[model samples]
Target: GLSDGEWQLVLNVWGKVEADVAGHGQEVLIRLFKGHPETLEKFDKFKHLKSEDEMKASEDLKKHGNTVLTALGGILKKKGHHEAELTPLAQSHATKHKIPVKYLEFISEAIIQVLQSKHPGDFGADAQGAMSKALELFRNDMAAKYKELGFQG
Candidate 1:
C-alpha cells in the first residue's frame, strides 16, 4: 500500500516514536478515552479513571498503552505481512475482550491523530495516507477473523 520511500518514512517515523513508545502509547489511549469517553467502558480497569490526569497516572493504563505501542511496533516490523500476525489479535479482541469493531476504528483514529500531533514534521499527507491504509488493513484483517467466528460486524 506504500511506496518503498513511503515505507522507509514510516519506519523512520516509528523509530523516532519508539524511543518514547511509553509516552506515545499513553497519548494514544488518552486521546481515545478523552475523545470517546464511552470507549473506556470496555476496559473495566480504566473505567474508574475519572480524570485525564488520573488516567495518565494509572498503572493499568500504562500497561495497556505499552501493549498498543508494542503491537503497532510489531505491525510496522512486518509491514507487508499483516494477516498472519494480526489473526490472533483479532480473535482476542473479538472473543476475549469483546470490544466492538467501532471502537477498533476509534482507537485507530486516535492513534493516527496522536501520531500526527506528535510528529507533524514527519507525518505528512503521504505518511498519513499510507498509515491510514495500513491501519485499515489491520482493522479488516481482524474483522475477517471475527466474521469467521460468526460474529457480525
Candidate 2:
C-alpha cells in the first residue's frame, strides 16, 4: 500500500498530465519508441512509424496512445482499487495481444522517464520513488494474472 505522502505525490503528478490526453500520451509513447525501438515490432500497425513526427501524424498512433493514457488515468482515479482493474487488463493483453507482462517494464520505464524529463521539479527525490513503487505494485498484480494465463513464448 502507498503511504499518504505517496498518494499525494501521485495524484498531483497525475493531475498535471491527465488533462492533455493526446499530447501527453503521444509524448510517452514517443519516448518509449525512442528508448526501445525494438518494441515497435510488437505493433504491426505502428512498425512503419520511423520517427516521432511520423508517429504523431498517424491516427492509429494517436488512438493507441490515448488508450494507454486513458487506462493510466483510470488506474490513478481508482487509486486503491487498481488491482481489480489491472487484472482484466493484464489478462486481455496476455490473451488478446499476446503481449507478455514483461513488456510493461518498457511502458513503465517510459512513464518514469517522461515524468522525470517533463516534470523534473514536481517528481523530485521522494516523488520518483513513490511513482515507481506504485507502478511496481500494479505490475506485480498484473504479473500474477499474466502468469496464470501461460507463458508468452
Candidate 3:
C-alpha cells in the first residue's frame, strides 16, 4: 500500500472585511510557531504526544491567543491592520445578536477538521457539517443586518 497525505486550508467567507481567512491563517501559524520555540527541534526528533495530558499541554503551549477574537486580534496586529480589520468586526459582533461566539471560536477548529478528515477515523464528522452551515448563515445574517453600516463587499 501507498501512503498519500497533504495539508489543507479552510476559510470563513466573512467575519473580517479587511482580513481574509487565508491571511489570518498565515499570520496565526507564524505566531504559533514562533511562540513554540522547540517545535522545530522536536519535529527533527520526530516527537509525538501519546497521552491526553501531553496533547493538551502541547496545544496550550502552541496557543498564543486564548479566544477567537484574541487570535484574530493577534494576527491582524502583526500585519499592522488590527484596527482596520477588527474594529468594525468587533462592533458587528457586539451589536449583532444572531452570530454566536461559537462561530467565532470555530474558525481554527474548522480548518483543523478539514485537515483531519483525510486521515480516516481521526475525528468526528457530526460537528463539521453543522459548523459549516452555521458559518454560512452567520456570514449572511451579518451582511444583511450590517449592510447599512458602510460595509461593502
Candidate 4:
C-alpha cells in the first residue's frame, strides 16, 4: 500500500504529464535514448537513429510515448492504491521486457529530468521524492511481483 498524500503529490506532478502523454512521453524516452545509447536497441529499428531531431519526428517514438507514459499515467490515476491493472503493466516492464533494475533506475532519472525541465516551479523536492519512490516501486518492486505471482509479462 502507498501513502495517500504521497500519490496526491505524485498526482500533482503527474497532472501536466497526462495533458500530453505522447509529447511528454516522447521527451522522456528521447532523453533515455540519449543518455543510454544502448537502450535504443529495444526500439528495434531505431538502432541507427540518424539524429535526435529525426527521432523527435519518429512515428515509432510517438506510439511508444503513449505506450509507456499512458501506462504510467494509469498508475498515477489511481492516486495511492490500485494493483490489479498495475500488476499487468509491471509484468510487461519487468518480466516480459527483461528490463533490469539499472535501466529502470535510469528511466526514473530521465523521468525526473523531464518533469523538472517542464515544471521547475511546481515540481518541487516533495513531488520529485514522491515520484522517485513511486517509480522506484515500479522499478524494483515489480521484480518481486513477477517472481512471487508468476507474472508472465
For each candidate, the alpha-carbon lDDT, in order, equals: 0.83, 0.81, 0.39, 0.78
Runs in model 3 deviating more than 4 A are 1-64, 69-122
- Taking all chains together, each candidate's TM-score versus the true structure is 0.92, 0.90, 0.30, 0.86
| Residue 45 of model 1, lDDT score | 83
Q: Candidate 1, TM-score vs. the true structure?
A: 0.92
Per residue, candidate 4 scores C-alpha lDDT tens digits across 1-153 of: 458888788888888887888888888989999999778876665777767998898988878878889877777676546577677866666655666657777788999999999999989988888888788777656666766756433
After superposition on all C-alphas, the RMSD of every candidate to the true structure, in Å, is: 1.4, 1.7, 15.9, 2.6
Window of ten residues with lowest summed lDDT in model 2: 144-153
Better candidate by lDDT, 3 or 4: 4
lDDT of 2: 0.81
Model 2 residue runs over 4 Å out of place are: none
Tens digit of per-residue lDDT, candidate 2, span 1-153: 888889888888888787677777887888889888877888899999888889878897878888998888788766667777787787778887777656788899998888888888788988898888888877777777777767553
Q: In model 3, which residue pairs have backbone atoms overlapping below 3 Å?
A: none
Better of 1 and 2 by lDDT: 1
Candidate number that wins on lDDT, 2 or 4? 2
lDDT ranking of the models = 1, 2, 4, 3
For candidate 1, write residues 61-114 as lDDT tens digits: 987899888987898778768777787787788888888788889989998998
- Model 4 misplacement above 4 A: 149-153
> In lDDT terms, how accurate is model 3?
0.39
The alpha-carbon lDDT assigned to residue 61 of candidate 3 equals 32
